[PDB]
Each structure stands twice: as C-alpha cells, then as structure tokens.
Design a binder for these strands. Structure first.
Lengths: 467, 154, 284, 173, 190, 190, 153, 173
RNA sequence: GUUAAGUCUGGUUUCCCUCCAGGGUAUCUUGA
C-alpha cells in the first residue's frame, strides 16, 4: 500500500450531517465525512460512465452493473476497495457542542395544562420561544457555539435554508395531563440544541483529501484503465459537484487548491488537468476548461478498452432511470459575491420564483419544467406536457409517462420523494476571488428527446438571472 | 404424541418452506436461520424474540396470514423479502412454543395482535425462561441445517 | 421482571460504569422493540423515567401509528446518546489487569512488549458482533466481564501477520506465526481501553442510497444510527514470546500497520490508530 | 570479529567491482542449503538508488531493503561513501537464520548522501519477470558463492525465493 | 453478568454456582479424605453450611434480593448470614442457584467469539472461513485434586514441585492470549 | 439427564434402569439365596414389587408422570403402587423403563471422549495420537455379590476386611481420576 | 453376512472414480474418517442433517448423483468439501437403495422434485433406528477403504 | 517435447555407448537428493538382453526393467530405430517422484527385436557384489552425471541405493 | 409584498467452518 495522490480541496458553506443530521453534535464535530466523499465519488463515476458509454455507444447500463465493473477499484461485498480515502481537516480536533445554560423556566411554568405548539426564531442574536398560545418569551442561552450574525441572516435570507429549518425549530407539547418541570426542561433543551446546532455553517471549509492504493491489484485484467477512469471521475466530481446536502443548490461546492501526486504513471494526466484549475482567470475560459476534460475522457489517448466486458447490463427505460452529462447544457458565469448568489437560487428553482415567472412566463409550464428539471415537486393538466408521445408544445416528454394510464413513470416522476434535481448549480472559485458560478443540467434517461437549444436558452437565462 | 426436536423441525420447516412463494423470501429466511440461532445465545431468547417480532413488521395482512399458517396448508406469507423471512422465523419459534406446550396458542396469537397482552407476554416469557432456553437451541440448529440444505445461497 | 425493564434507562444514566452494559443494552432492546406497548395503558412510569417524555411530545396527530414509529427513531437516537455520554471509561481496573498479568508473564520467563495505541478517528471493531445489534443492527466488540470494548487478540495478530507476510514473504511469516503443522512463536492479548479524553462510545450514521440499487428510480436513503468508539481512546495490549528473534519483526511492523486500519470501514478512514507507546522487557 | 559487506539486491545490477574480497573469508553468513537463501538481512528506513546502488537514509519506517550480508571489505577504493558498524548480532534483523553468528560483527553498508537537492519520493519495487531474476544468480551468487552448478540442481528454489523474498523501496529518481 | 435494582454496591458480574456442583466438590473431598490421611474439615464445613440451604437460590457475599442473570433469567435470592467464611477470597458476591436454573444461567454464561479467515488478494472473508469458539470468562474457578501414591519421588514432588508451581497454561489458543491459569492450593490458601 | 414436563418438581438427572437388569439381579438373588443360609427377603420383595409392573415405565421415588431423558426420549411414567420404598437412598428419583427404550437411553448416558497426544517439543499433535474413549458416568451403580466358602480365613475376611472396604479403585485410567468407586454392602445399606 | 463389505467396495469404487480431482478424494477421506464416529455418538438424524446441510443439494449437483447411481462416467462437480459431502451422501443413499430400505424409484423421484425432498428426509426420519444399526459395518468398511486407498493430504 | 534417453542399468559395461551427450540440457531428471536416487522410471512387460542390453518386449507384467531416465538426446545416432515414444509424462510411471513432471517427454529406450531364436525364459538379476556398484559410479554417475563424486562426502551412501532400487530381470544368453 | 407548513427514508447481502492427526508403544494318567 502507498499513496496514489493527495488533493487539497475547499468546501463552501457546506451542510454536512451526522446522525444528528447536523455538522455538530454533543460529542464531536464533523464538517466533512469521508463516507460521503466516497459515495459521491462512486455516484459521479457511475454518471461519467453512462456519459461516456452513451456518447460512444448509445447504450446505458444499470448502476449495479457499473458497480460490478468497477468493483476492482471501489470494492464490493466480494472485494475490498482498492482505494483508501483519508480526509484531513485543519483544526480537526475536539469541538463538540456544549450548551452550558439555557435558563428556560418561565416558558415551562406557563406552558402547563395546555397542549401548545412551540417554535423558535432568532431575532437579532436573541431567540424567542414563540409559543403558539399567543406568547413569546426571549430565551437567554449560552453555548460554545458562536453563531455570527452573518450566518443568521444567511439562514434568514435564503428561502431554502429557512425551509428545511422547519423540521428543527418546532415541537408540540401536550402538558394538559400532569407533567413535570424536569422532563419539560429536557424536551425544551433538546429542541434548543437541535435549533442551535443547525447554525454551525462555517464558510470556506478547507480540508485535504488523500487517496491510497494497495499495490496488490495492479494490471490484473484492466485494473490500470479502470483506476484511471476512476480518477478522472474524481476530478469530475470535484469540478461539477459538492459535498454535504443541497449540493444541487450551490452549497458545499468544492474547489481545488493544490493537487500533488506520487505515482506519475497513473496520475500525471489527472494532476495536470487539476492544476489547470489553480489559475482560472475568466468566466469564458472556465467553460472551455470544463469541456476539455468532459470531451477528452471520451475522445483522448487512453479512454476505454473495457466496455466490451460482459458484466454490464442495459437499462429498462420503463423501469430504470440513469443520469449522465450532456456536456452542452452548461453556462458558467461570474458572481464575486457568494452569499447573495446562494440566496438567489431559490428565485430560479421555485414554481413562483420571480426568475422563472420571467423566463418560462407560463403556469402549467413552469410546473412541468420544474418537475422534469428540479427533482421532486409536491402536488395533489400538467401531464399533457410530460406524456410520452402526445400533442407537443414544450418538449418535456417522458420515456414512459403515459397520458393518464397506470404505469411506472406515471408515479415515479410524480410520487417519489427522493428524486435528485437535474438542474444543478455550483460556485467554483480559484484562489483569487475569481468566484465563477456553474449551472448545468444532467441529461437523464427518462427523456424522450429534449430541445437542447430551448433548454440551453432557459439555462443561460436562469444563470444570468440568478446573478 | 411427542415429536422430538428434529421431527418438529421437519414439520415446521415444511409448513414454512411451502408458504414463501417468492424465492428471495426463501433465501432471506435461510440467512435468518443461519444467524439467529447464535444471536439467541449471545443476547437471550427474550430480547431476540421481540427483536424478531419487530423486524417482522407485523400488524398488517402479515398477521392473519401467520395465524392461518398454523392451519391452512395454503397460507402465503407476503411482504418485503426481509419482512417475510423474519415472519417465517417468528412462526418457527411460535410453532415450537406451541407444540412443546410451553405457551398456549391462543395466548400467543392474542399477545401478538395487540399491545396490552404483549407486556404480560414479556412477563410470561421471563417466567418460562429456563423451560424454553433449555432445549430450543437444538430445534433451531435443526432448522438451520434444514434451511442451509434445502435452499440455495443469495 | 417488567419492573426491571421500565426502570432500565435511569439505571443506565445513574450507574454509568457499574451497570453491565451488555445486559443493559440487551434489556433496553426489549423496550425499543416494543415501543408502542410500553407507551400505553397508564404504565407505572415515574416522573423521572426517560419514557414519559414521549407521552408529551406529539410528532403526528393524524395517525396513531406514525406518531409511534417516529417516537421510536427519536428514542433510538436518544439511547445512542445515553450510552455515549453516561457509559464512560474508568481504566484503573484495566491498568491493574495488565500490570498483574505482566508480572505473571515475567514469572513465566517471557519477553513482553507492552503496546499502547490511541484511536485517532472514530473506530469500529466487531461491527457484526452483538452489542446493540438488537437496537442499532451494528454491534461493537465488547467484553461483558471487563465491561469494556476491546480489540480481539486474534484480530491484532492477523493484521500484523498480513503485514509481515506482505513484506517478508509468506514463508518468514510462517516461521514467525507458525502454520497448520507447527506452532506460532508470538502470543497476543486483547487490547482494552485504558484512558479516554471525554467519551468512550460515540454515535454515528451510515445512509446508503445506491447500495445494490439498479437506477435512480429505486434509490432511497436508509440511515443506520449505530455506535462507534470515540477518538483519543487509548488501548493497550501485551505481546509476549520466548525466542527474542520474533521480537525484531514485531518491533517494526507495529508502528506501521496502526496508521492503516485496525477495524472495520477503514477504506473510508475510520479505524485509524497511532502507536502511543511501545516497550520491551527482555527476560532471557 | 570480521568485516562483513552488505550486497543489496534490487532488480538492478551495479555490484560487479566493489569489494576487495569476493568469495569472502572462510564463509559468508548467508547460506544456500537447498531451502533457498538463508540468514538474508533486512534494512529498514533506507532506500536504494537503482543507479549507483546505495542505501540512502529516508526516515520513513515503511522503507526497507533486503540484501545479502557477505564476508569481505569494499576494495579500499571506498570507505568514504559507506557505513561501517560493529553490531553484536542481536541487533541484526535477519530472515531464515539457519545457523549461529559471531555475536559481534563488522558490517559495511553502501551508503549515500541524502541528496538534499531534490526531495526523496520512494516507490515499492518488487521482483518478477524471470528475465530479471535469470541473471541474479549469474551476477551475485556464482561470484559470491561457488555452489552454483557443482551440486545445485534446485536452482528453481532460490529463483522462486528471490522472486518472492527480496523486495525493497527505491527512490526511482 | 447481572442486572439488579435496589443494591447498594453495583455489580457488573457476579460469581455463580449451583448445588450439584457443590455436591460434586463435597463428593471429591469426602472421597479423598478416606483414601488418604488428609482431611479438609474447613472446605467441608463451608460447603455443608451452604448445602443445608439446598432448594432455594441464595447469596453469600452481598445483599441482593433479586436480579436478572445473563439478561434472561429473573431470580429471587435470599442472603446467607455473614458467619460464612471467605471461599473465593475476593470481593464479589457468590450466588448459589437451584440446579434447574443454574444449569441455564451457567451454560449461557460463556463467551462465544465469532472469528473469520481473510482472503489475501481480495482482502475479504474466505468462503467457509467463519466459526465460533466458546471461552470461559476470566476469574472462573475450577476445583480439582492432585492425588499421589506413596514413594520418595512423590515426597520430593509434593514438597518441591507442587510449591514452586503457580502459573500454567491450559487449553488451546495459547497464541491469542488465552489459557493462562493460577493454581491455588486449598492446603496453602483456602 | 432429564427435562421434566408436566411435573412441578425440577430434577436435573434421575436414575434409570430397565426390567432386563432387575431380572438379572433377581437371578443373582434367587441363586445365592439357595447356595447360602442368607436370604435377602427385603431386597427380593422390593424387586418383586417392581418387576410386578413390567411392560410400563414406572418411577419409584418421585411423581413425574412424564419426562424427556437424555434430551431425546419421551417416556410416560407411572407411580409405583402408593410409594413403594426406595432401594438405594439418594433422594433422586429412580426410573424403571421398558427395555427397548432403556437400551438407547443407557447408550446415551455413556461418556465418549476424544483424546489426543501432543509432541513434547513442538506443541503439535503426534501423528497417530488421536483416539476416542468411553467411560461410564459417575454416580453409576453396579450390582455384584462376594461369596465365600467355609473356612476360618473366610470368617476373618467377612468380619474384618469387608467391613473396612468403602473406596477402591476399579478399571484403568487411574491417572485421569477414573475408577475411584465406592462399595456399599446391601446388608447394611438396605 | 459380510456382503456389506462388498457393497462398500461397489460404492467406494463409484465415488473414487467420480471424485476426478484428487483434492475431493483427500477430503472425502476425512469425511469418512469423521462421520462414522459422529453417527455412533450423536445418532443418524443429527449427522444426516449435518451432511445434507453441507452437501449443498441442488438440481445441478443432485443430477451428478442420480447419474452416478446408474452411469459409470459421472463426475461429482463442485468445491472440494462441497463434493466430499455429496460423495458421502451418495454412499449413504447407495446403501439405503441396495438394501431396499427405501425404494430407488421413490428416491429418484424425490431427489428431483425439490418438493418431495423434504418427504425423502421425513421418510428417512421414520427409519432412523433401523438404519442406525444396519449401516454401521458398511460405514466402517467405507472408512477403512478410504484410509487405505487414499493417501493423506 | 524435450528429449529423453532412458539408459538401462545392467551388470555389464557397455552403457557408455548409447549417446555422447551424457548431460542433455539444463536438467537431470533422475536426481541425487541425499535420500537416494529419485525420479526413477521402471517399465513393465519388458526385459533386458544380457548382451548389449536392449529391452526385448514380452507379455509379462511381473517382469520389469529398473533404470535411469536421463534428460536429453541419444546423440541423434543411437535409438534411431528402437522403441521410442512421446508421453504426457503422467503415464510415465516414475517411482519415488521428487520433482516437477515436465508435462510431456519424448523418451528413447534400448530396445531389442523380440529375439526369436529361443523361448525366452526370464532370470531375476539382483545387483550385489559392490564391484559392479563401485564400477557403475565411475562409468556413468560421473560421466553421465555431473553432481557426484565431486562434493560427495558420502560416496557409498548414494552408491548403496542401487542395491535396493535396481534388481532387473535377464535371460542369460 | 405578505401568511403558514414541512414531508419521505429509519440496515441489507455474503461467509457458519477448512487442513492434519482417526490410535501408538508393552504384555500374547492313577487304581483296577
């Protein structure tokens, strides 16, 4: 075993989460989970592979088949991972969340004998335990967690951060029956702890990812080509995605700071392609830098001699959904101010967003576009635009989505909570306040055929408009 | 008449094996057979028994099917491929507790389906802990052999 | 009795190193797996038992089942945090055990290599072991009589031998650790925690989305709240032998393998240690 | 005591004219007894330069070099670039010890200046590809020992052990 | 391993024995006092002091009125008067269960450690490379006798060897830190 | 070993015999009752009361009404005609089974043990040194008769030696503690 | 009579041929060396379950047995131990057939159903006390044959 | 495959003339392992003519021929008309196998036409009288072989193997 | 420009023993 390479990355307003689904908890502090990094690396590898093997074959493979293929480098239940991650953070020491005193007696004493909803709200670094029972008590807490006003108004201005804050800020308490001043202290302490730990949003988290290779699987069947494609995918992950949650809305966007390597034979090209992103200086050269790698992986010196292997398996477009990169639905921009940009992306991804009412300029159409592009969307007509082969106005036709007949895509697109957004944003910067936004759209498999020109128009309009 | 542990295992595994229509259910049941017998030693019959009842995710159509399996010859366990395996292993253990006469059948089918009786079932189990734990591990070892013989791997 | 059951969590938080953690968790699991039962029929819950909290908290009023199934996950996380903050490490008994055993082995003419190692990253050992398996589905290698987690001696010896045979050849490895037709020349003991910084057990999570999934169409997070071992916990263990030869490859291998993994999930950097101290007491 | 020379064995071969005594004194400590190489020695914390084979101190404890500890003294055109030690034979880190040792030695290791002009990036270099081990016997055992093809019919044994026992870390720079 | 409420001292594990085991010890002692000139009127006295209480779970070295042994067996105990001398010569209580309960409580009180065998090139588990092993806990006490027939070498043995003997290695698994054992002679330290 | 069912009296082991052994004892007692002036009416009447109930498994001491012996065999006992006194006196029940069942029950009771031989220096088994080995459990009771012809030395034997014989050593494996045994004369133990 | 010492030679010849890879031979040797003592101590139904659990019966490898019955160029296929247990299962079933304890037609139509296989096992369970005594000398013969004809691995 | 000249082991002195290449290539098949002569071949149903030993084939399984299978050519001159084969090297019944089976061998054998002059009745020849045995060692085991009587501290210990490993049959004409 | 609400998911899958040792040495017409 030895090192393969060692990157030095930098997250940006990341929203990682542990069991607490917070970045911090009473026991430790974890800004960057290496398990999330490995999982996102595998995900981006399976996206890059269906990009490659579709641009050059028209074919698409199931995720499990791609994983059986890359098991040699990413491991499976039958083989240990050949690559070993190691995430090292500057100041990665004991930083648990210590809530010292909260002094919440009064709110308890006039909460008794009343089943009463209880919320929380930071009002100028003072949280107000807004009882629903027409009562607001200012809580006087103190913790080791120093929530800057900047983070407070980041959460407050962003309509997404202030949305997922609904699950942490409230608790309903039924003290009608007999109830104690001791258990209620603890209930309120837990609510306060959740709401507080939510606000551990450090900006510009800087860590140092390492990769190790075992030196035991070298050139077994196609190991070196697989490893090279995997490293390509790691670079693509660093350039196109982030870590943490809400990465498809800018948060956690990774940026390269310095890439070093120690086994040139496998890593020289990847280190060069990375070093390309230590010097970005124009918003119009970043597009070309993206495309260079995006199209070289498919059409360069060493690309593929292993797609012919019989482990892979095609997809069943009536039951399988698989993503891949279009390499053309991309629009890079420049921001120079990241907080307000992150707060803006809500205006461009909501059905009533000012930035969408002025680009699609239509009900029944904004809805359908966001449903197709934009992940899951609650609903309780529109299908006339997503029906597979039907009267066409805006070409958002879905491979199997029938016009009001029971099917799979009849609900997966409509009733399935966990659906990633194809419309993905990112804030990539290069060590000089260069600070370019990237917005792209992954090409999914459930699309019949998309008007790439019209969708590109929408994309660039949202990209200028979000700034 | 008194059927020994291996005869009882045959008679139970025959009812189960013919109720898991889906083959994935069969293989999951096999993987339960192979490890719950050791979990029961390491943790105890009572903790593991209620762990099985929880993993079975009962209180559905997955309960009257179970109570019919005691006498249907057609009862079909349904549910997720992991729920049916645990429900089948639960039927295994209940079949033992009932045939050995350690606990009444109707008392078990009552303590399963709602909550007030589940607690006195806990108490009853703690009373009969030596009566049960003395000899159930041989019956479950028999079930383990039958399973990892009559079923293929996943 | 069920009386012992209802009163178990206060026992946990009021004994905290003198309750048997194995039995304690095994009995807590009966409450955990029968949640909607212990939360009914005007139970004999005191005004301090950690369970009537869920009679207050109302997570769902439309459904009686979903309320209970949400309270159950809340309770699982609460039990993880309880075990984590209450059950801490008192390592005087382990120091006594190891020094007494060291004297014993000096009385047997062995060359001893006392080795202290410190956890850097949240470690897992014996994840398929049974401690919390009835709650968390993921255990920890625990010793129910020393009442402490440990690293099995077989595991340390196997890791060390894999290294030695990686660098010195599978024949010198067999010369040191014996083969199916000869005995080994090195003996290892389990590693017990001697001193922590603040915690012993710490909660963690693993949420597979696309493990064994075919497409983005069946992806769904499935979070697994389990327990791990805190960072900065120190384990010590002895390594004794008779012919001092086998003491040369144990000298160099030990500080080299610990910086790699020593437990589970090490390919995502979890079971990482560091050689806090080493010491040989030659007795030829 | 007696002088002892350490013939490093990487895949390269730069060991032809280095020693004043080739066949040694009465005997080497490394043996060839139809069970492969015996008493082969290990050196940890140093790496060998594939060109001008020399042990360089690279403080990483993972770095190791295995070679043969022969009888001799290096040609007396040397001792400005070597290390020289008297070790009591318990400090040695041997492999397959098939005898007894004088219990106080005089070891001669081919040393190198640590080259503080470029960093020291090492890389594990195993041994395989028979054409590289075909000549190891033709270079460092027919001159170092005479047993080569007078009673040796088990050449395949020492071949396979060279192919598996000897590994090392080299600076590759 | 034991769980109990309402005990002043908290115990993580307790010594346990049953009545048939004490009857076997009494048989050994009664049988060797006849086949030799060596009677042990102290062990016999303590053991019959205990055995008189047969048919009910009791306790010697502490005050537990009930517990849950090995997280499966609820037992209700009765304390024995502290006139009983020290048998184990330690600070841990010693339950003596009725045999139909102590049977389970003891045979479920051994440690089963599931081990594996790792495949080299895959670094994963070999197939058919998984098994369990029962160890017996630390500080377990086994009673035995070392009888010797008349001779002169027997005298030198019982006066020179059996004294300077204290620590032996029993069993297997000697190389994973198992098998170390201390022999305490009743004649010496009862 | 017994696992009692539908019996509130928990025993962990009983004494098992068959009618085909009681009949051989009856033979031994009819014969030497004629070849001597010493008739054994008490024991003979006990055995006759038992053998009167052949064809049914019966339990003498306790009331079990059902049981499971050696964890395999289910038998349905029947008490003996209003508590016929016990032959041996140990408080443990004695079961007299039909002969077919008793055959395999008794076969299960025997103790088979694999042993090994280990090379002295290498701590590894000596190729060839592995064998099985069968004992009869402790607490087993055999029946025999010691007969003597008229002489003075015979009287001195039967009045001075046989009265101080309690413990002898039978069989082999005397170094493994096997074979320590206790003679209990019928005239005085019954 | 000692015709079991001849039936043993027949069945052992068939196995010995069918274990085309010498590892299967060296393994079946140990199986024959162990399972006879196991049947003596524990009984027939325990050891039979322990055999069928490790034989890994399936329509593929169970056909490699039904063919081995009549044919002479069958080859038991699988892992080393996986077939060292099915060879021993073949030994047992061969004795049970050539002694008319069970009918060969009832067995072959049960080694295939995947359903009446449980019924084969039950039928066997009914006859356990008889078989436990009948097969003793047959299995001791097989043990001796294996110890002699096969050299230790 | 590779060539094999099987010598016959007579009591006579003519075996020096079957081949000039007494070594072969890089390997001697019949070894000298200090435990005796290994990799020995014996063939059934044959015999050896006492005059210029050549295997007169018969139909007798009890008959055999106990000899040395030398790796190499019959100098391309002899055995150009005799019993010669190519075998998968497994059907080559090697006794006291102590090496690698070359997986195929092309063997040359001293063969004599069936000798149709008389009804050939066998005669068992059991080597003794170590003058033949002190002779064979110098005739071939230093001329054919290359690893004996040079390093051999034991000259007669490897010479005594012939006593109990090569007792062939003859016809004595 | 504002009001309010979060919802869904809550561990699965493999491996359950493999190899050697299966007994060795000693004891074997007397009267009629």
């Amino acid at each position: 075993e030895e090192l393969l390479m060692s990157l030095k990355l930098k997250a940006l307003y990341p929203l990682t989460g542990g069991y607490n689904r917070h970045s911090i908890n009473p026991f430790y502090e974890e800004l960057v989970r290496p398990t999330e990094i490995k999982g996102l690396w595998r995900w981006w590898n399976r996206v890059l592979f269906n990009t490659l093997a579709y641009s050059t074959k028209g074919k698409l493979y199931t995720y499990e088949s791609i994983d059986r293929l890359f098991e040699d480098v990413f491991g499976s239940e039958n083989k240990k991972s050949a690559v070993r991650l190691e995430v090292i953070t500057d100041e990665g020491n004991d930083n648990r969340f210590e809530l010292s005193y909260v002094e919440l007696d009064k709110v308890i004493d006039c909460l008794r004998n009343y089943k009463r909803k209880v919320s929380l709200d930071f009002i100028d670094n003072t949280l107000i335990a807004e009882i629903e029972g027409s009562t607001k008590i200012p809580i006087s807490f103190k913790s080791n967690l120093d929530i800057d006003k900047i983070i407070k108004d980041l959460v407050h201005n962003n309509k997404l951060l202030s949305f997922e804050l609904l699950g942490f800020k409230s608790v309903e308490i039924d003290a009608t029956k007999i109830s104690d001043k001791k258990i209620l202290k603890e209930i309120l302490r837990d609510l306060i702890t959740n709401y507080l730990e939510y606000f551990n949003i450090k900006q510009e988290v800087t860590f140092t990812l390492n990769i190790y290779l075992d030196k035991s699987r070298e050139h077994k069947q196609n190991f070196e080509d697989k490893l090279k494609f995997a490293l390509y995918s790691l670079l693509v992950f660093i350039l196109l995605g982030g870590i943490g949650r809400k990465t498809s809305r800018g948060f956690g966007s990774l940026s390269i700071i310095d890439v070093k390597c120690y086994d040139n034979s496998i890593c020289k090209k990847i280190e060069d392609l990375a070093k390309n992103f230590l010097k970005i200086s124009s918003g119009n050269e970043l597009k070309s830098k993206i495309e260079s790698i995006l199209d070289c992986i498919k059409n360069s010196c060493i690309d593929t001699l292993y797609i012919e292997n019989n482990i892979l398996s095609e997809i069943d477009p009536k039951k399988n959904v698989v993503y891949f990169i279009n390499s053309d639905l991309f629009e890079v921009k420049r921001i120079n101010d990241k907080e307000k940009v992150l707060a803006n992306i809500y205006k461009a991804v909501s059905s009533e967003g000012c930035c969408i009412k002025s680009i699609i300029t239509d009900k029944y159409v904004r809805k359908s576009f966001l449903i197709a592009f934009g992940g899951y969307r609650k609903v309780e007509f529109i299908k006339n635009y997503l029906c597979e082969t039907c009267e066409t106005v805006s070409s958002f036709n879905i491979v199997d989505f029938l016009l009001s007949e029971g099917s799979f895509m009849s609900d997966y697109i409509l009733q399935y909570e966990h659906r990633n957004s194809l419309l993905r944003f990112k804030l990539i910067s290069d060590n000089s306040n260069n600070s370019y936004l990237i917005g792209y759209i992954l090409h999914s498999s459930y699309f019949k055929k998309i008007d790439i020109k019209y969708v590109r128009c929408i994309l660039e309009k949202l990209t200028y408009c979000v700034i | 008449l008194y059927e020994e542990d291996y005869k009882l295992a045959l008679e139970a595994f025959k009812k189960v094996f013919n109720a898991l229509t889906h083959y994935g259910a069969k293989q999951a049941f096999r993987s339960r057979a192979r490890d719950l017998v050791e979990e029961i030693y390491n943790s105890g019959f009572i903790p593991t028994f209620f762990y099985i009842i929880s993993k079975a995710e009962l209180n559905s159509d997955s309960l009257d099917s179970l109570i019919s399996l005691f006498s249907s010859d057609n009862a079909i366990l349904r549910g997720s491929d992991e729920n049916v395996s645990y429900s089948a292993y639960l039927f295994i253990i209940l079949y033992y507790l009932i045939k050995r006469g350690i606990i009444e059948q109707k008392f078990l089918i009552q303590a399963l389906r709602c909550e007030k009786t589940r607690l006195d079932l806990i108490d009853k189990l703690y009373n009969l802990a030596p009566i049960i734990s003395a000899k159930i591990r041989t019956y479950l070892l028999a079930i383990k052999r039958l399973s990892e013989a009559l079923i293929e791997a996943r | 009795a069920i009386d012992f059951l209802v009163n178990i969590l206060e026992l946990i938080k009021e004994k905290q190193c003198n309750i048997n953690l194995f039995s304690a968790i095994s009995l807590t699991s009966i409450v955990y797996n029968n949640f909607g039962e212990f939360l009914s029929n005007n139970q004999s819950y005191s005004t301090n038992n950690p369970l009537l909290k869920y009679h207050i908290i109302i997570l769902n009023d439309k459904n009686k089942t979903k309320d209970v199934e949400e309270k159950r996950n809340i309770f699982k996380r609460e039990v993880a945090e309880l075990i984590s903050r209450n059950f801490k490490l008192d390592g005087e008994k382990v120091r006594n055990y190891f020094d007494s055993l060291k004297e014993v082995l000096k009385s047997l003419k062995y060359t001893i290599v006392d080795v202290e190692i410190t956890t850097r990253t949240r470690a897992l050992i014996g994840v398929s072991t049974s401690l919390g398996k009835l709650i968390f589905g993921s255990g920890i290698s625990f010793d129910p009589y020393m009442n402490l987690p440990y690293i099995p001696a077989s595991e340390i010896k196997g890791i060390v031998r894999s290294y030695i045979e990686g660098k010195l050849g599978e024949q010198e490895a067999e010369e040191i650790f014996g083969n199916e037709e000869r005995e080994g020349n090195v003996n290892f003991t389990d590693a017990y925690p001697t001193r922590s910084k603040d915690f012993l057990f710490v909660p963690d999570v693993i949420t597979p989305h696309y493990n064994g999934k075919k497409s983005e169409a069946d992806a769904e997070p499935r979070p697994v709240i389990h327990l791990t071992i805190a960072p900065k916990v120190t384990f010590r263990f002895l390594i004794y032998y008779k012919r001092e030869d086998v003491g040369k490859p144990i000298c160099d291998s030990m500080p080299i393998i610990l910086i790699r993994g020593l437990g589970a999930r090490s390919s995502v950097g979890y079971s990482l240690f560091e050689l806090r101290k080493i010491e040989v007491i030659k007795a030829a | 005591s007696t002088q002892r020379e350490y013939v490093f064995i990487p895949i390269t071969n730069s060991i032809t004219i280095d020693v004043k005594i080739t066949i040694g004194g009465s005997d080497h400590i490394t043996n060839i007894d139809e069970r492969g190489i015996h008493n082969v020695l290990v050196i940890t914390g140093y790496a060998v330069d594939e060109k001008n084979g020399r042990l360089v101190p690279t403080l990483d404890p993972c770095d190791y070099v295995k070679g043969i500890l022969v009888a001799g003294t290096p040609q007396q055109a040397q001792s400005n670039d070597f290390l020289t030690l008297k070790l009591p034979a318990n400090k040695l880190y041997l492999i397959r010890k098939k005898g007894n040792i004088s219990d106080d030695l005089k070891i001669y290791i081919p040393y190198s200046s640590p080259d503080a002009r470029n960093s020291m990036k090492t890389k594990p270099v195993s041994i395989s590809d028979d054409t590289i081990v075909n000549n190891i016997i033709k270079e460092v055992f027919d001159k170092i020992y005479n047993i080569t093809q007078k009673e040796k019919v088990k050449i395949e044994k020492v071949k396979e052990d060279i192919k598996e026992l000897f590994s090392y870390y080299a600076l590759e720079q | 391993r034991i769980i109990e409420i309402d005990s002043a001292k908290p115990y993580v594990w307790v010594y346990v024995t049953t009545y048939e085991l004490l009857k076997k010890v009494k048989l050994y002692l009664d049988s060797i006092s006849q086949l030799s000139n060596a009677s042990f009127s102290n062990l016999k006295n303590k053991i019959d002091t205990i055995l008189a209480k047969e048919g009910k779970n009791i306790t010697l070295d502490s005050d537990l009125k009930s517990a849950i042994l090995n997280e499966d067996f609820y037992v209700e105990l009765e304390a024995l008067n502290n006139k009983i001398p020290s048998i184990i010569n330690a600070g841990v209580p010693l339950l003596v269960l009725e045999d139909s309960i102590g049977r389970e409580v003891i045979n479920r009180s051994l440690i089963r450690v599931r081990r594996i065998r790792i495949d080299r090139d895959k670094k994963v588990v070999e197939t058919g490379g998984l098994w369990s092993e029962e160890y017996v806990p630390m500080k377990t006490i086994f009673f035995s006798v070392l009888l010797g027939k008349e001779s002169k070498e027997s005298a030198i043995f019982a006066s020179c060897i059996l004294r300077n003997l204290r620590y032996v290695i029993l069993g297997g698994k000697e190389t994973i830190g198992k098998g170390i054992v201390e022999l305490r002679w009743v004649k010496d330290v009862i």
